[PDB]
Design a protein around this ligand. Structure first.
Ligand SMILES: CCCCCCCCCCCCCCCCCC(=O)OC[C@H](COP(=O)(O)OCCN)OC(=O)CCCCCCCCCCCCCCCCC
Ligand code: HEC
Ligand code: HEM
Ligand code: HEM
Lengths: 55, 49, 378, 239, 49, 100, 73, 65, 48
């Protein structure tokens, strides 16, 4: 849970750099998904995508 | 030589020649009704009548 | 032996950022050195992008700024970073000065004087930058402060027609202030290096004022992550200010174009220069007003010459502590009075606030100090 | 007099700390501005390419631009003919000169509506109450050349009240009261003032999720590396 | 114009109470208003310099 | 006299009996005070740097000592004042010899 | 001000320091932090705030007197 | 056309502050009708009435609109 | 105004610049109007 994580990705340094790059990309993907989800969830209605769907 | 170079740079920062091309005008007062002010641009400042 | 302790660059980096002996006691108030440094390089970078998209002429300056804030990608956030970074820059500058005045760090002489010269330079730079957008407030601010320079007899009027670039605020004034605003922060960076050099000569301070020669800890990696924490807090304050209420501090009256005929009623600085403008219009005399302003910042020069106490900090002197908080509330009162119109209660308490400012500094600090020197049998 | 009046606090749809504008309301306000307010004022810095993705589609943008023919350069002859204008034009200025603007009104330069939201004390609520509260003076007659409206420094505007109950009757049902046209033109002026309110609120939301993430954790690293000095202990041995 | 406390010219910057004649009553104004070189020519005009 | 009551309340509320410091642990150091610190016996000097290091520790944690270890006004062993008086007297004598 | 080594002179002083991986991150952050912040607040508000309540009184009184000067008309 | 704004404005002046402002404006009308041909011409009463009325309009309008 | 000291006096260059129309900008009503022009004028553009 934590012991395997330290045994894999935190003894060497290059593996730590590799996992911070891969984690930054996964965080990019999931974070932009969550950000657009929340922002077009609190402004439902008056946003240009639904008005485009009228047309 | 140093004081002449300083004098030429200070005179470079003084003014221009086309800025010194500002002179007289004639202004009309016929349009204004009672108790009111009219402004006219002259040397970069307003001009009250 | 080592890369770091022999190389000519890394000896400088070693005596700055790694093995500088810093005291183990300094609170959060000793973060604003690094916060002013990070704000200064952030101003330089974001202003450099704005200067890549800017055309300095009185015909097209406001049009070019509107072109930045509409048409260029992200020019609106870079412009808002520049303006509110100026605002947070002066917040951290006055907190830096308040630290250095309260904890008795004005017993340093040469660092303090180079500090005051940096204060002059940053104030002149931020005023020239505030002239640059070429709005109505910028036009009249340039006009009134240039006539304030014309207030002095025998030097003034020639000097002011000399820096006017003509006979009023013409094209040449906008280009002159673009060039000096676009050069002066590099001089501010060089004098900041000189400031930091005299500091690393002497040695830092601590909240007790006792010299901490026994308990120095290295700068890295304790205060480096402390300054990273301070930088993250500053960037979140700056960015919430530029992304939620960008107009909460800025002037509404800027956004009209420069008409030299109107003279709006509520003329005022941007909010950091209110007390400089409040000392001015609360004295009914021209030379007296401009001389009292210059004497205010020269009173900040004077301040090391009145350390007649025998502790160092004001941590242990409660009387001078209460008088310092009266001084802080009085400066905030001057800022509020400067940010108002001019009528009868405002006239009276503006005059009274300026008088009480000079009375607190030039009289009340040594009287509190001599009651301290008497009271503990010294 | 110089008794200014602060306009009231109106519950807008862009009032909250994360709410967005209403793009259908921006579109209605632009139809209002095309058919009412563009006869006197000017909105120099709003080009038609700003209207392509925000409210309309691209086709009606070309339609609206080819409704009004503006100007073009020489046709290798020096005659300055009329171009329909595809998308890159700014909006057509009604008056060329400021003197031309004074030469058809009682003095009274019409202010430019690109920045009237951000340029006056009080936001678009000032524009709402200025468009709304036309009433009568109790006793003060001024010259009968100007009109009375109390949300104004000087208390006498030179603008005729340009709304008066269904002058437009636009696309959908939505009958033109004073309220609908004033709400739409305030929303449109807020859009024309800040073109990027929506993307600003988007980055503000991403930033609040940032400072939800990082601020426990940079502070956790600081607490961790400073947890050596927060627990070191001392003792004094003499010989 | 038409402001201050005397029915005249009020400078809003620091509070120079001038009037429609142009004389200071309270404020940091050192002198009165600036007089031009104005000369009346016959019907409606005045040369300004 | 009540001025001694003022002095006792002031030594209570001054904040340097809180951190375990005595009267002469908080003195600002110019050249004269540096000389008077260098003119000390060894045991007082070691006790002084120990109290100073405890004060910097307790202000680093911003924790202030329990009730049973505050320095009390009745046992105020101020010690640095005679050496500091001797430094001031010799300095003023040297200054007067330069003036005349 | 210089580097380490030649600053001061210390006799016998013993310093113990625990490893940072050994000890917790936040030692009792909500059983001592709240009494410490209430103690440091109670030892400062009587020297900080009585100028600021005077500023609050000046702000309210100046607002009231400007409304006094303008609300008769 | 059925205007909503005039409906809200006629239905919101029932509150006590707006009533007292209405009588303030009417007593100023009595004053300048009484001291006729004067130079004190009913400013504060009308501004205070518009202040109170438009604030109660601000409280409870945009639900309907 | 460059010719005011080089190869003419002041009055002669004022005559030579009052011989040519300028088409200055607006007036109170503000279409445009021509102007003699003393010195602030360049050499005016035979083909626009
Ligand atoms: C708006 C202003 C907001 C100020 C907020 C200050 C909050 C902290 C107040 C406080 O706690 O003050 C007491 C404290 C005593 O010092 P310390 O030893 O650190 O504390 C241990 C026990 N209290 O002292 C402190 O914690 C800090 C004491 C003040 C240091 C900062 C000064 C404030 C800024 C002053 C600006 C003006 C300076 C002069 C500028 C002149 C320009 C012409
Ligand atoms: C021609 C008759 C106009 C029409 C149609 C509209 N406006 Fe107007 N407006 C006009 C003038 C001559 C003036 C100037 C009056 C002055 O003294 O400034 C104005 C003024 C405005 C203002 C600014 C007023 C202020 O607060 O200083 C605004 C915001 C404004 N006008 C908006 C506006 C809108 C939104 C219109 C369409 C519905 C509109 N005006 C029509 C002249 C005319
Ligand atoms: C141009 C803006 C300034 C910058 C960038 C700046 C930068 C710094 C930095 C980086 C430090 C070292 C870190 C610190 O001690 O906080 C410092 C220290 C200091 N500065 Fe400045 N400074 C500026 C303006 C001033 C001003 C105006 C003064 C007042 C005159 C001043 C007085 C001091 C003092 C007294 C110290 C030592 C503080 C201490 O050791 O505790 N500085 N400055
Ligand atoms: C050398 C570095 C700098 C550059 C290149 C720079 C560049 C610019 C430019 C191009 C502008 C015009 C854009 C605008 O007005 O928004 C500007 C404005 C401004 N600058 Fe700077 N600047 C620099 C440093 C600073 C500093 C150090 C300050 C003060 C902290 C400052 C404060 C301002 C202010 C207040 C404005 C007006 C902003 C506004 O009203 O929109 N600038 N600067």
């Amino acid at each position: 849970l934590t012991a395997r994580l330290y045994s894999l990705l935190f003894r060497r340094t290059s593996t730590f750099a590799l996992t911070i790059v891969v984690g930054a990309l996964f965080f990019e993907r999931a974070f932009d998904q969550g950000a657009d989800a929340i922002y077009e969830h609190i402004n439902e209605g008056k946003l240009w995508k639904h008005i485009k769907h009228k047309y | 030589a140093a004081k002449n170079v300083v004098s030429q740079f200070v005179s470079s920062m003084s003014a221009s020649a086309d800025v010194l091309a500002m002179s007289k005008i004639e202004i009309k007062l016929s349009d204004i009704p009672e108790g009111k002010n009219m402004a006219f641009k002259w040397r970069g400042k307003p001009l009250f009548v | 032996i080592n890369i770091r302790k022999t190389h000519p660059l890394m000896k400088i980096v070693n005596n700055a950022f790694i093995d500088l002996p810093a005291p183990s006691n300094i609170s959060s108030w000793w973060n604003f050195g690094s916060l002013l440094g990070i704000c200064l390089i952030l101003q330089i970078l974001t202003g450099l992008f704005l200067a890549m998209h800017y055309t300095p002429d009185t015909t097209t300056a406001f049009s070019s700024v509107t072109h930045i804030c509409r048409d260029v990608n992200y020019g609106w956030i870079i412009r808002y970073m520049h303006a509110n970074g100026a605002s947070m820059f002066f917040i951290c500058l006055f907190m830096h000065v308040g630290r250095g005045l309260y904890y008795g760090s004005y017993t340093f002489l040469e660092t303090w004087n180079i500090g005051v010269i940096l204060l002059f330079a940053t104030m002149a730079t931020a005023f020239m930058g505030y002239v640059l957008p070429w709005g109505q407030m910028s036009f009249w601010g340039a006009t009134v402060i240039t006539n304030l320079l014309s207030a002095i007899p025998y030097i003034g009027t020639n000097l002011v027609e000399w820096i006017w670039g003509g006979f009023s605020v013409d094209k040449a004034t906008l280009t002159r202030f673009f060039a000096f605003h676009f050069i002066f922060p590099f001089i501010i960076a060089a004098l900041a290096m000189v400031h930091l050099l005299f500091l690393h000569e002497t040695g830092s301070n601590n909240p007790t004022g006792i010299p901490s020669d026994t308990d120095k800890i290295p700068f890295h990696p304790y205060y480096t992550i402390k300054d990273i924490l301070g930088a993250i807090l500053l960037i979140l304050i700056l960015m919430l200010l530029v992304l939620f209420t960008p107009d909460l501090l800025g002037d509404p009256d800027n956004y009209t174009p420069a008409n030299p005929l109107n003279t709006p009623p509520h003329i005022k600085p941007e909010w950091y220069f209110l007390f400089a403008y409040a000392i001015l219009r609360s004295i009914p005399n021209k030379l007296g007003g401009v001389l009292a302003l210059v004497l205010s910042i020269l009173v900040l020069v004077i301040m090391p010459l009145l350390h007649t106490s025998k502790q160092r900090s004001m941590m242990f002197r409660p009387i001078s502590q209460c008088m310092f908080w009266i001084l802080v509330a009085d400066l905030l009162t001057l800022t509020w009075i400067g940010g108002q119109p001019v009528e009868h209660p405002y006239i009276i308490i503006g005059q009274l606030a300026s008088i009480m400012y000079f009375l607190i500094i030039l009289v009340m600090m040594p009287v509190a100090s001599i009651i301290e020197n008497n009271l503990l049998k010294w | 007099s110089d008794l200014e009046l602060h306009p009231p606090s109106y519950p807008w749809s862009h009032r909250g700390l994360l709410s967005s504008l209403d793009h259908t309301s921006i579109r209605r306000g632009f139809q209002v501005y095309k058919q009412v307010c563009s006869s006197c004022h000017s909105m120099d810095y709003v080009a038609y390419r700003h209207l392509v993705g925000v409210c309309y589609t691209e086709d009606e943008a070309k339609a609206l631009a080819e409704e009004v023919e503006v100007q073009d350069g020489p046709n290798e002859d020096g005659e300055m003919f009329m171009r329909p204008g595809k998308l890159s034009d700014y909006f057509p200025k009604p008056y060329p000169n400021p003197e031309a603007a004074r030469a058809a009104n009682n003095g009274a330069l019409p202010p430019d509506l690109s920045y009237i939201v951000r340029a006056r004390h009080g936001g678009e609520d000032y524009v709402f109450s200025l468009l709304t509260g036309y009433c009568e003076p109790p006793r003060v007659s001024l010259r009968e050349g100007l009109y009375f409206n109390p949300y104004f420094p000087g208390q006498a505007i030179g603008m005729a009240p340009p709304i008066y109950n269904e002058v437009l009757e636009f696309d959908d049902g939505t009958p033109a009261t004073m309220s609908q046209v004033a709400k739409d033109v305030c929303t449109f002026l807020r859009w024309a003032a800040e073109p990027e309110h929506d993307h600003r609120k988007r980055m503000g939301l991403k930033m609040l999720l940032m400072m939800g993430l990082l601020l426990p954790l940079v502070y956790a690293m600081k607490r961790h590396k400073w947890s050596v000095l927060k627990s070191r202990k001392l003792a004094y041995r003499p010989p | 114009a038409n402001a201050g406390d005397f029915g005249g010219y009020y400078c809003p910057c620091h509070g120079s109470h001038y009037d429609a004649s142009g004389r200071i009553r309270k404020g940091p104004a050192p002198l009165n208003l600036e007089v031009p070189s104005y000369e009346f020519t016959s019907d409606d005009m005045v040369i300004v310099g | 006299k009540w001025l001694e009551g003022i002095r006792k309340w002031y030594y209570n509320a001054a904040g340097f009996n809180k951190l375990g410091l005595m009267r002469d642990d908080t003195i600002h150091e110019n050249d004269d005070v540096k000389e008077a610190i260098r003119r000390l016996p060894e045991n007082l000097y070691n006790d002084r740097v120990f109290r100073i290091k405890r004060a910097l520790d307790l202000s680093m944690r911003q924790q202030i000592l329990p009730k049973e270890q505050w320095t009390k006004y009745e046992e105020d062993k101020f010690y640095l004042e005679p050496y500091l008086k001797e430094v001031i007297r010799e300095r003023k004598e040297r200054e007067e010899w330069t003036k005349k | 001000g210089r580097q380490f080594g030649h600053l001061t002179r210390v006799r016998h002083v013993i310093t113990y320091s625990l490893s940072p991986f050994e000890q917790r991150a936040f030692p009792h952050y909500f059983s001592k932090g709240i009494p410490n912040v209430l103690r440091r607040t109670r030892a400062c508000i009587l020297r900080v705030a009585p100028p600021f309540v005077v500023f609050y009184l000046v702000y309210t009184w100046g607002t009231q007197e400007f409304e006094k000067s303008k609300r008769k008309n | 056309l059925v205007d909503p704004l005039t409906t809200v404005r006629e239905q919101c002046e029932q509150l006590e502050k707006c009533v007292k402002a209405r009588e303030r404006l009417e007593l100023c009308d009595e004053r300048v009708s009484s001291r006729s041909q004067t130079e004190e011409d009913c400013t504060e009463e009308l501004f205070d009435f518009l202040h109170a009325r438009d604030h109660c309009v601000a409280h409870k309008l945009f639900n309907s609109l």
